[PDB]
Write a protein that binds this ligand. Structure first.
Ligand code: CLA
Ligand code: CLA
Ligand code: CLA
Ligand code: CLA
Ligand SMILES: CC1=C(/C=C/C(C)=C/C=C/C(C)=C/C=C/C=C(C)/C=C/C=C(C)/C=C/C2=C(C)CCCC2(C)C)C(C)(C)CCC1
Ligand SMILES: CC1=C(/C=C/C(C)=C/C=C/C(C)=C/C=C/C=C(C)/C=C/C=C(C)/C=C/C2=C(C)CCCC2(C)C)C(C)(C)CCC1
Lengths: 122, 56
């Protein structure tokens, strides 16, 4: 079990937990029971930006970018209600957490694209 | 003395200084190529190879 001192400065604090390859099971939903997501974590690995159309007005593509703000990108410790709906669908209603990160990515040629990477009120 | 249009003739019988003058000329030309490339990179818009390529 890893401590803060094991993790500090490694980059691991910006990573979401993983599950091993054996985790292919099923988690039963009792429709009479109430549920929550106690922790939602989102670790971005790629940011793509839609190029501004030259004026050809064809399909502008999403292109790769370089992250310049370092390992500061993940959303984590997010919690909320997991409702069971009458048709048996589940609805997550985000309540709180570290649910945003300012992120700056850089396009080929230098243009910097800041964004508020977020799931606020998901 | 030498007329202005003959000043470089001092190099004719001086192989070492001729090599120096050639080195200087070469330095100037390579310096031009470097500077020119930099100026072009500082002005070039790479955003549209179709209707705004380098030759425009
Ligand atoms: C490749 C270029 C080049 C090279 C290697 C040489 C080399 C030589 N010259 Mg020649 N010369 C040149 C070009 C060159 N010259 C030009 C363009 C002129 C007209 C100005 C002259 C006029 C000249 C005279 C009158 C004499 C020489 C002489 C000599 C010898 C001694 C050095 C000297 O006194 O230079 C003097 C030359 C200069 C200082 C060049 C002038 C510098 C110009 C203005 C450019 C400077 C660059 C600047 C920073 C950029 C300005 C940017 C602008 C947009 C504001 C040596 C063999 C001497 C010699 O041995 O006589 C027997 C001598 O008396 N040169
Ligand atoms: C590789 C090419 C080359 C080389 C190494 C030489 C070298 C020489 N030339 Mg020749 N010449 C050339 C090509 C060349 N020339 C060309 C193309 C022409 C026709 C334009 C001539 C016409 C010519 C004449 C009529 C004479 C020479 C003379 C000379 C000698 C003295 C140069 C001097 O002191 O000027 C000193 C020059 C200055 C102090 C200033 C010159 C300023 C010029 C006119 C304007 C600015 C030029 C700019 C800086 C250069 C840009 C580079 C360019 C290629 C775009 C020397 C042996 C002289 C000679 O034989 O002496 C016995 C002489 O009378 N040349
Ligand atoms: C080993 C045999 C050898 C080699 C490899 C060369 C090569 C060269 N000579 Mg020639 N030369 C030779 C024999 C040789 N020479 C002999 C026996 C004589 C009678 C003394 C001459 C007389 C002569 C004259 C009068 C001139 C040349 C020049 C040149 C250069 C013209 C191209 C240039 O400047 O490119 C651009 C340069 C580069 C891309 C960089 C090259 C990197 C260099 C070679 C490394 C420098 C370190 C090295 C240990 C010291 C100098 C090596 C020397 C053998 C050239 C080139 C480096 C001209 C010159 O020097 O112009 C500036 C010139 O004016 N040579
Ligand atoms: C094949 C390519 C080539 C060749 C053969 C030459 C040859 C020459 N160069 Mg180099 N040069 C080149 C490429 C070349 N250049 C490139 C790509 C650059 C970067 C832009 C330069 C930059 C350069 C500089 C800064 C200088 C030279 C000079 C010289 C001359 C040195 C020998 C001399 O004393 O002539 C004596 C001069 C002449 C015979 C007169 C040449 C006249 C030219 C061909 C046209 C002049 C146009 C006009 C009258 C004046 C310019 C317009 C003005 C508004 C600026 C010689 C004519 C030196 C020189 O001219 O010193 C006096 C000099 O200072 N060159
Ligand atoms: C020393 C050193 C260094 C550096 C260097 C440099 C920085 C450079 C440069 C350079 C340069 C930066 C240069 C340049 C140049 C230029 C030129 C040489 C030009 C020219 C021109 C001309 C000749 C023109 C003409 C004309 C006109 C004006 C108009 C129209 C017509 C004509 C075109 C004729 C280093 C660190 C590496 C290292 C070792 C040492
Ligand atoms: C050993 C040593 C040293 C050294 C030094 C040196 C070696 C130097 C040099 C130098 C140099 C050698 C410089 C230079 C220069 C230059 C120039 C001054 C130029 C110019 C230019 C121009 C002006 C250009 C223009 C242009 C063009 C051509 C094209 C494009 C456009 C433009 C406009 C940009 C010292 C003393 C520190 C001390 C200790 C040691």
């Amino acid at each position: 079990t890893l401590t803060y001192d094991d993790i500090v400065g490694t980059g691991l604090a910006n990573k979401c937990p993983t599950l091993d390859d054996t985790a292919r099971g099923a988690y039963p939903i009792d429709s009479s029971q109430t549920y929550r997501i106690a922790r939602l974590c989102l670790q971005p690995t790629t940011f793509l930006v839609k190029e501004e159309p030259k004026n050809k007005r064809q399909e502008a593509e999403f292109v790769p970018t370089k992250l310049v703000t370092r390992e500061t990108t993940s959303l984590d410790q997010i919690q909320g209600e997991l409702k069971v709906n009458s048709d048996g669908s589940l609805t997550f209603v985000e309540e709180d957490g570290i649910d945003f990160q300012p992120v700056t990515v850089q396009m080929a040629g230098g243009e910097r694209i800041p964004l508020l990477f977020t799931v606020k009120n998901l | 003395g030498l007329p202005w249009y003959r000043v470089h003739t001092v190099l004719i019988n001086d192989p070492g200084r001729l090599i120096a003058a050639h080195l200087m000329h070469t330095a100037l030309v390579a310096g031009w190529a470097g500077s020119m490339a930099l100026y072009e990179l500082a002005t070039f818009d790479p955003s549209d190879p179709v209707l705004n390529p380098m030759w425009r």
